[PDB]
Nucleic acid binder design. Structure first.
Ligand SMILES: [Mg+2]
Ligand SMILES: [Mg+2]
Ligand SMILES: [Mg+2]
Ligand SMILES: [Mg+2]
Lengths: 63, 386, 225, 136
RNA sequence: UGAACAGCCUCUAGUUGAUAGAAUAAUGUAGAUAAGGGAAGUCGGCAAAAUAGAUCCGUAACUUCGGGAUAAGGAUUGGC
RNA sequence: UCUUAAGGUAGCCAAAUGCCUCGUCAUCUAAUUAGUGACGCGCAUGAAUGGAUUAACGAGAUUCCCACUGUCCCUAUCUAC
RNA sequence: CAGUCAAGCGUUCAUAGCGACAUUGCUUUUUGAUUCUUCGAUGUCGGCUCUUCCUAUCAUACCGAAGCAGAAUUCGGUAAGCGUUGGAUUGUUCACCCACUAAUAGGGAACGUGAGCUGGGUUUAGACCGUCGUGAGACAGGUUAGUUUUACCCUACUGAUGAAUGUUACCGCAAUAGUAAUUGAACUUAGUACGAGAGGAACAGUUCAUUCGGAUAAUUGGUUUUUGCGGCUGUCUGAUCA
C-alpha cells in the first residue's frame, strides 16, 4: 500500500480513508477528512490554521 | 380494473412473520450433512460480534481488471474464546421426526454455565446438578448404561457446549449453552470423543481454518415499532396528502372484503433471526499472541484491537475470526458460526487470501494513527509528557 | 509488414501497445491473436512485456518510450515499476514523471534522435526527457493539434502526420525533425494516426480496417521493405 | 454504454439523471450537453435513468452552434463531480460534469479534450483516451 | 440598536395564570437540514428556496413624455 | 340579375366568440391537443349590443427563459408538542 | 376472440404462411336492450399509491414447423415462475410522438382503490362571449372563480402480552403455513460453422452489469440539543473575567 499526505494539513492518509478531489486545472488534492476538505472549500490558508504541519513549519513550533 | 403500471412487489414474503425472535440466540435449523469417513469434528461454533474494520489485500482474479492489484475490504471481527464441552445428547429418528432420548452431562459444571439455569442467582442455594454429580463418583453404574444406550440407538449425536463469557469484556457473567452436531466417524466414535472431551475446551482453529466459506446465524438489531415506509420500503405519498404521507394508500380492493396478508403494514422492525451464507474467513487469530494485527508485509507488532478499543465492546484478548463483509446482529451479540452446507467452487470460494495491512485506527472518530508509538512520533512531545 | 491486429475488437493498436526498437509493451488483457502478432513478428530477440500502467489497460497513451529510456506517469504503482525494471533490459532507464498532463504517450511524440512535445509542458519535464531519453526536444503543434503523440506516428526512417495538416507545417516539421513526413490516414480514415498504429525500424502494427493504400503509405514512409 | 464498450465497467455511483446539463469538453463548438437518455439503463417505475462516468448517453446541444442544436446525438461522460468509490477505496470527484460528442460506435466528433478525464472512461473508450490530455 | 410608536433586549409597573408526573414507538401538527442532479414531480413551480438594508456605477423595448425604473446588471459594507 | 327594409362597411380572428378541429403554414422542444406569429366562404366576428389600438396599473387567466430549491430521482435525520 | 369447409393467392403447389362465398361457437375488458335491487342517498371522471388474480404470452426457459443455408423473421405447443419503463402535449381514459430496453402484452377485483390522497374535469349558486328567444332564460358550445366532514366500536390485517396443562428452569423436535431471485452486456469460441458473395451464429469458459430481496455501518456522504469547541450581532449583568 501507499500512505499519502494531506494536501491541506499534511496528515498521513491510510488506504480507504478520506477523499480525493481533482480540480479543473488538473491538480489532485487529497483530504484526510471532511474538516480539512471543508476548510479547503472555504478557501482558508493553511499557513494561518494553527494545527497544520505547514503552520508549525512556518512558526518553528516543534522543529 | 388492472394496475396501470407494473412494478415489483415491495418486500420478501418468505421472511414473514416479521416478529421478534423467540430468543437472543438464533437457532441452527440445519447442520452440514454427515459422512462417516472424516474424523470427529464439530459443525459450528459460538462467538460474540465485536465490530468491523478494513483490510488491504492483493486481489487474485485471473481475468478481472483489478487482477494482481490492491483492494480495501470491510471485515467484521467475532471474538471467540475456547468453548467448553459439557454434555452430549443423542437423537433417534421416528416417523414423527428426530427425538432426543437421553442427555449425559459432564461432572464438574462451572458457575458461568450453571448460571444459565437460574433467573435469580444471587438468592439461591446453588443446588443444580448436585444429585447428578452424586450419580457420578461411583465406578460407572448410572453413566455408561446411558452412554451405551446412545451407542445402541440415537442415529444423531449432538454435543452440549457453552461459551466462556468471563473471558470477554461483556458484563453478563452468564454463559450461552448450545447443541453442536458432530460430523465424523461412527456413533460410538462420536460419543467416545464427547466422553473424552467432557470438562475440556475446544479452540476455534480446531473447527475453522483460513479461506473457508462459512455461515453466520444471529438475531438482527432491533428497531421497535416502525412505519410501513421504512419497514417495507414503499413509496412516500406526495406532500399535499391529508392525514399523513408515510403510509400505503390502498390497502386492498373492495373484494375480497378483508385486508390481505400480503399488504405491507406497520409493526416490529428488526430483532429477527437470520442466516447469512457464504462469508469467507480471512484470519483465524490467536489471542495468546502479540502482532495479531500484523501481516507479513506490515510487520509491526500490534494487536487486532483498535486505538481506544472497539467502540461499545472493548478488547479482543481471546481468539477471533476475521470474516469478510457484514454479518447479521450488532456488537456484543452472541452469533453462531456454521460450516457450509455445500461445497462451493465458484472461482471465488477457492481464492487463497493473504492480507497486506489491517486497520487499527480509532473507530470513535476520524483516527489518524494506527499505534500510539506512531501518534507520538508524528506529534512530537506534548505538555502532559515531560 | 504493417500487421493487421485488433485488441479484442479495437483497431487502435497504439493505444494498447508501445513499440520501440529495443522492447515492446502490451496490455495484460489481450487476446491470443494480439499477443501472437508481436511474438511472431518481433521474435525472441526483442522482449515483450505484458504491463499495466496506473491500473489502466491503455499503456501507449500513458507512456512515452525510447531505446535508451522509458517514461511513466506518477500514478504508476511500485509493483508495476518493479515488474518493468525486472522485465526490461539493463540498458533502458525507467523514471517516473511528476507532471500535470500525465499522459505521456499523448503528450510526447518521440524517436531515437529528436522529439516533439506538447507546447505547455513544464521545464523540469523537458529536461527530464532530454536527460533520460537523451533526445533533443521541440515544443511544436501539428497544424494546431497539441496532442502530437496521438496525431503523429514517428520513427527513424520517416513519419506519418495528421491528414488535415498545412503543407507549410509539413516542410517546417520535416526540416525540424530531419525526416520525411507524409499526411495520411489509418484504420479506414481515422485521424488519430499515432493512436492508430505503432512502428519501429523494421515493424509496423496497425488495425485490421486499415486499407491497402494506407498500408502502402505506411510501408513507403517507414521504409519497412 | 452498450455496443462500443471495450470491456466491462464496475458500478460507479450514478450522478447525472435525465435532464442534467453538463459542460461539453471537446472542441466541436458545442458548449453544453443536455442528457435525455442513458444507454443500457434499466426499467423501474418513477425512477429516472441516471448516468455515471464512462457511460454513453443521448444528448442534445442546448447552447452552442446552430448545426449542432435541435438534434439528438450520442455523448460520453468524462467528468462526474459526484463522488464515487474505486476498488482501491479512494472516494474521488471532479468539480464539474463534462462529456464529449460521439457517434454510436464511440469515436469522437471532436479532436481534443480540455481538462481531465477519468480512467474508468479512458479504459472503456479508446478514442477518448486517444484525444484526452490528462487521464486521472 | 436602528430611518422608524418595525423586530430584538432592558428600566418603572404588572404577571409567573393555561391539569400534572414518567418515558421518547409508529402515524401526525409545527419548525428545520440535506451529497449529485435541478421541475425530470404536478392540471399547474402548489409548497419551499433564492433576492432583500444602505452607498457608488449602470439601466432596454415601449410610451398618453408624466413613466417604465429598485428595470435588467455589477461593486462595496467590520474593528481600530 | 332575382329577392329584401338593407345586404356585414372600416376593422378583427380557430380570439374568453370556429362545430368540423388536435384547422393549415412557420416558430418554440429530443418529442408540444399547450404558447406565439400568420391565413380566412367567419357552424355562429364586427362597429356606444360599441369596433380596433393602447402606456401605466392587477392577491385576474395563459406560455417561455434565467436564478433557485427534497416538487421529484429517493429518501434520511433532528427539535418541540 | 376462436373454429369447420376450401374457390383461390403463394413461380410451380388448397392448407409454409394466408384464405373468398358460407357456417359453428366462445367472452363480458365495447356499446346496446331490459328495469330485478337501491331515490328516510351504496360518495359515477381521471391520476397517484398498493396488493392479488386471469391468460386470449410482449420478453425470459425448453421445444415442434417453415417458401428454416447463416443472420434476421414467421406460425405453433407446455407455460402466468418472473418482468413489462423515462418523457413533451392534453383534466382526460384513449391517442400521438421522443427515447431507453429482453420487452415496453392484454385484462379483472362495486367500470378495485375519495372516513387513502388530489380536485385538473364534470356537476349548484358569481361572471364573459357566440348562437337561439320579445322576454325571463336555454345551450353532450367555449371561458374563468368556486368549504372534499367523523373511526376511540366489531371484524379483517400488522405487530405485542397472556390464565389453565404439579411448580420452575434449560436444551430441543417439526405438524402446518409462507418462500425468491431476475435479466442483460463484453471477451473468447470466431470472422469459425453456413454461404456464390454480401454477410455471419451457437454450446462450454471468464469478467461485469440491470431489476429485486436480506442485512450492516470499517470507509465516504447526509443529519446535530453532544447546545462539544470556536467565532459573530443586538441588549443586560458598572468594566474585566464569566
Ligand atoms: Mg386501477
Ligand atoms: Mg397489467
Ligand atoms: Mg465510528
Ligand atoms: Mg410516475
Amino acid at each position: 500500500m501507499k500512505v499519502e499526505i494531506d494536501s491541506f494539513s499534511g496528515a498521513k492518509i491510510y488506504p480507504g480513508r478520506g477523499t480525493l478531489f481533482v480540480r479543473g486545472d488538473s491538480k489532485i488534492f487529497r483530504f484526510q477528512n471532511s474538516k480539512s476538505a471543508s476548510l479547503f472549500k472555504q478557501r482558508k490558508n493553511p499557513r494561518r490554521i494553527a494545527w497544520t504541519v505547514l503552520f508549525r513549519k512556518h512558526h518553528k513550533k516543534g522543529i | 380494473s388492472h394496475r396501470k403500471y407494473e412494478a415489483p412487489r415491495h418486500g420478501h414474503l418468505g421472511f414473514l412473520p416479521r416478529k421478534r425472535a423467540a430468543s437472543i440466540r438464533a437457532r441452527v435449523k440445519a447442520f452440514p450433512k454427515d459422512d462417516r469417513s472424516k474424523p470427529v469434528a464439530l459443525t459450528s461454533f459460538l462467538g460474540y460480534k465485536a465490530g468491523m474494520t478494513t483490510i488491504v489485500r492483493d486481489l487474485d482474479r485471473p481475468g478481472s481488471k483489478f487482477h494482481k492489484r490492491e483492494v480495501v475490504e470491510a471485515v467484521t471481527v467475532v471474538d471467540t474464546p475456547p468453548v467448553v464441552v459439557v454434555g452430549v445428547v443423542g437423537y433417534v429418528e421416528t416417523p414423527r421426526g428426530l427425538r432426543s432420548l437421553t442427555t449425559v452431562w459432564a461432572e464438574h459444571l462451572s458457575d458461568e454455565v450453571k448460571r444459565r439455569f437460574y433467573k435469580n442467582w444471587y438468592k439461591s442455594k446453588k443446588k443444580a446438578f448436585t444429585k447428578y454429580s452424586a450419580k457420578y463418583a461411583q465406578d460407572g453404574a448410572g453413566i455408561e448404561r446411558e452412554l451405551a444406550r446412545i451407542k445402541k440407538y440415537a442415529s444423531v449425536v449432538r454435543v452440549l457446549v457453552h461459551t466462556q463469557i468471563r473471558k470477554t469484556p461483556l458484563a453478563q457473567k452468564k454463559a450461552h449453552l448450545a447443541e453442536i452436531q458432530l460430523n465424523g466417524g461412527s456413533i460410538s466414535e462420536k460419543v467416545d470423543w464427547a466422553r473424552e472431551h467432557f470438562e475440556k475446551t475446544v479452540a476455534v482453529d480446531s473447527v475453522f481454518e483460513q479461506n473457508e466459506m462459512i455461515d453466520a446465524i444471529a438475531v438482527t438489531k432491533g428497531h421497535g415499532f416502525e412505519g410501513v415506509t421504512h419497514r417495507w420500503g414503499t413509496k412516500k405519498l406526495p406532500r399535499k396528502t391529508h392525514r399523513g404521507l408515510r403510509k400505503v394508500a390502498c390497502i386492498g380492493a373492495w373484494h375480497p372484503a378483508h385486508v390481505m396478508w400480503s399488504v405491507a403494514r406497520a409493526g416490529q422492525r428488526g430483532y429477527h433471526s437470520r442466516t447469512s451464507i457464504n462469508h469467507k474467513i480471512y484470519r483465524v487469530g490467536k489471542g495468546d499472541d502479540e502482532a495479531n494485527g500484523a501481516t507479513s508485509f506490515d510487520r509491526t507488532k500490534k494487536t487486532i484491537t483498535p486505538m481506544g478499543g472497539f467502540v461499545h465492546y472493548g478488547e479482543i484478548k481471546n481468539d477471533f475470526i476475521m470474516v469478510k463483509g457484514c454479518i447479521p446482529g450488532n456488537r456484543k451479540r452472541i452469533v453462531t458460526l456454521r460450516k457450509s452446507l455445500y461445497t462451493n467452487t465458484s472461482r471465488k470460494a477457492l481464492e487463497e487470501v493473504s492480507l497486506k495491512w489491517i486497520d487499527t485506527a480509532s473507530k470513535f472518530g476520524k483516527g489518524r494513527f494506527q499505534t500510539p508509538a506512531e501518534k507520538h512520533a508524528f506529534m512530537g512531545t506534548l505538555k502532559k509528557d515531560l | 509488414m504493417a500487421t493487421r491486429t485488433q485488441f479484442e475488437n479495437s483497431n487502435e493498436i497504439g493505444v494498447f501497445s508501445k513499440l520501440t526498437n529495443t522492447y515492446c509493451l502490451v496490455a495484460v488483457g489481450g487476446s491470443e491473436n494480439f499477443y501472437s502478432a508481436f511474438e511472431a513478428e518481433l521474435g525472441d530477440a526483442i522482449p515483450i512485456v505484458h504491463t499495466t500502467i496506473a491500473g489502466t489497460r491503455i499503456i501507449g497513451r500513458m507512456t512515452a518510450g525510447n531505446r535508451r529510456g522509458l517514461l511513466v506517469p506518477t500514478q504508476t504503482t511500485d509493483q508495476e515499476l518493479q515488474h518493468l525494471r525486472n522485465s526490461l533490459p539493463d540498458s533502458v532507464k525507467i523514471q517516473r514523471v511528476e507532471e500535470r498532463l500525465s499522459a505521456l504517450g499523448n503528450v510526447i511524440c518521440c524517436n531515437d534522435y529528436v522529439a516533439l512535445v506538447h507546447p505547455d509542458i513544464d521545464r523540469e519535464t523537458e529536461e527530464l526527457i532530454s536527460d533520460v531519453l537523451g533526445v533533443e526536444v521541440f515544443r511544436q503543434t501539428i497544424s494546431g493539434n497539441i496532442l502530437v503523440g496521438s496525431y503523429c506516428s514517428l520513427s527513424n526512417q520517416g513519419g506519418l502526420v495528421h491528414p488535415q495538416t498545412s503543407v507549410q507545417d509539413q516542410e517546417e516539421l520535416s526540416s525540424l525533425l530531419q525526416v520525411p513526413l507524409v499526411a495520411g490516414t489509418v484504420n479506414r480514415g481515422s485521424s488519430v494516426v499515432g493512436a492508430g498504429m505503432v512502428v519501429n525500424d523494421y515493424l509496423a502494427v496497425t488495425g485490421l480496417d486499415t486499407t491497402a493504400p494506407e498500408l502502402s503509405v505506411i510501408e513507403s514512409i517507414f521504409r519497412l521493405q | 454504454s452498450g455496443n462500443g464498450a471495450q470491456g466491462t465497467k464496475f458500478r460507479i455511483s450514478l450522478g447525472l439523471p435525465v435532464g442534467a446539463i453538463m459542460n461539453c469538453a471537446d472542441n466541436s463548438g458545442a458548449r453544453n450537453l443536455y442528457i435525455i437518455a442513458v444507454k443500457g439503463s434499466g426499467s423501474r417505475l418513477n425512477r429516472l435513468p441516471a448516468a455515471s462516468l464512462g457511460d454513453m448517453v443521448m444528448a442534445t446541444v442546448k447552447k452552442g452552434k446552430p448545426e449542432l442544436r435541435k438534434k439528438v446525438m450520442p455523448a460520453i461522460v468524462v467528468r462526474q463531480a459526484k463522488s464515487w468509490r474505486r476498488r482501491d477505496g479512494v472516494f474521488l470527484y471532479f468539480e464539474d460534469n463534462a462529456g464529449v460528442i460521439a457517434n454510436p460506435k464511440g469515436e469522437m466528433k471532436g479532436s481534443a479534450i480540455t481538462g481531465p478525464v477519468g480512467k474508468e472512461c479512458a479504459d472503456l473508450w479508446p478514442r477518448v483516451a486517444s484525444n484526452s490530455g490528462v487521464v486521472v
